[PDB]
Amino acid sequence: REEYSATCVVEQPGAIGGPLVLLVQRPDSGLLAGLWEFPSVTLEPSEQHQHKALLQELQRWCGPLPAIRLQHLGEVIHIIKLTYQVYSLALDQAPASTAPPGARWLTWEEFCNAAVSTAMKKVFRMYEDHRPSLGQQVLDTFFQR
């Protein structure tokens, strides 16, 4: 089972301890449910480089933004087969109005001690290069076919 995705780390200047970053909350049901992660969008592998779905999702969490800084970073391979393309966006000011219900602009220390997925853990590593926490498992590992 191959699953293609694409995420982006929206970065804001903020004040002290910057820069600030946006983070949405995963749904309360499914695999790795309840954890916080960067805005992502699922799509078929036939459309594995489309910016429309990402920019549309960012507008639902930030409103309109001048598409003049969407930068590609690399590829996040999460071990279904999850393939996630990592992008990056930097804003010169604050979000349009405020963070809608479900968003949290945490700092670098506020993000290094919260709760995210192991896939997103590798997403924040590629962003810094170019610049006890448990996770729910799956019964497929114990019940072979």
Partner: protein
């Protein structure tokens, strides 16, 4: 030609109530042994295993092994039309693409017969390696439900501790943490409202309270529940159906 007559129709109502909220669609294995049903939820994190031995039916007949795909939501809606004291009868002919359900009121004044359209989907088969569990815990079903309900207000994960003394339920969250310690009842006895621990190696496992709160929907089936654990091994929550079989839930633990 498959026909199964069950005097206590409440059993079948409770069973669908215990699956509807966790599994939307599942395959029913019918054979001479009885009824078997195995299915994981969408997230592949939990699994349910239903076994209804044929000996527990008033009448049982199965001329051909059948694999029936059933919308559990639809089947629960239909079973809702049955009274707790009704005699339920399942019937499936050879060349019939539908399942027949006949509800018989006690005083024979009322007779209901239903027919759900039935479906079929490609589902994968698994296996449960019957192994030795390090610690088996037998406790009242209502108490286990209260525990899993209460700790859901504290946090979303529960740590089950095992030892020769007793079993500990812990959870942590934004407001604080809590520990529910159940002692090994040795001076109480009386009914099966007791707690017995059969412990070999100390077990320490963490689970998601969301899924456990779906399992306790099988509480009306049995007065007691058994929990089986091992070192880094899925949890076995077993609900005994009176001299007919059981309903087992499996739930994956976490590690870093």
């Amino acid at each position: 030609m498959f026909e199964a007559r069950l005097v206590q129709g409440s059993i079948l109502k409770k069973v669908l109530e215990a699956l509807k909220d966790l599994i939307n669609e599942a395959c029913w294995d019918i054979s001479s042994s009885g009824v078997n049903l195995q299915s994981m939820d969408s997230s592949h994190v939990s699994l349910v295993q239903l076994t209804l031995r044929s000996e527990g039916f008033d009448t049982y007949r199965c001329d051909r092994n059948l694999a029936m795909g059933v919308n559990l939501t639809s089947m629960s809606k239909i079973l809702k039309c049955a009274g707790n004291e009704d005699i339920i009868t399942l019937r499936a002919e050879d060349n019939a693409d539908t399942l027949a359900l006949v509800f018989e009121a006690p005083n024979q004044e009322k007779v209901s017969d239903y027919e759900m359209k039935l479906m079929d989907l490609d589902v994968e088969q698994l296996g449960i390696p019957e192994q030795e569990y390090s610690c088996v815990v037998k406790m009242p079903s209502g108490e286990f439900a209260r525990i899993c309900r209460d700790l859901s207000h504290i946090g979303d994960a529960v740590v089950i501790s095992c030892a020769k003394d007793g079993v500990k339920f812990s959870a942590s969250g934004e407001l604080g943490n809590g520990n529910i310690k159940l002692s090994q009842t040795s001076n109480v006895d009386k009914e099966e409202e007791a707690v017995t621990i059969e412990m070999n190696e100390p077990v320490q496992l963490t689970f998601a309270l969301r899924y456990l709160n779906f399992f306790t929907k099988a509480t009306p089936l049995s007065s007691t529940v058994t929990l089986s654990m091992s070192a880094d091994v899925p949890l076995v929550v077993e609900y005994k159906i009176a001299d007919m079989g059981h309903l087992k839930y499996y739930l994956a633990p976490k590690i870093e």
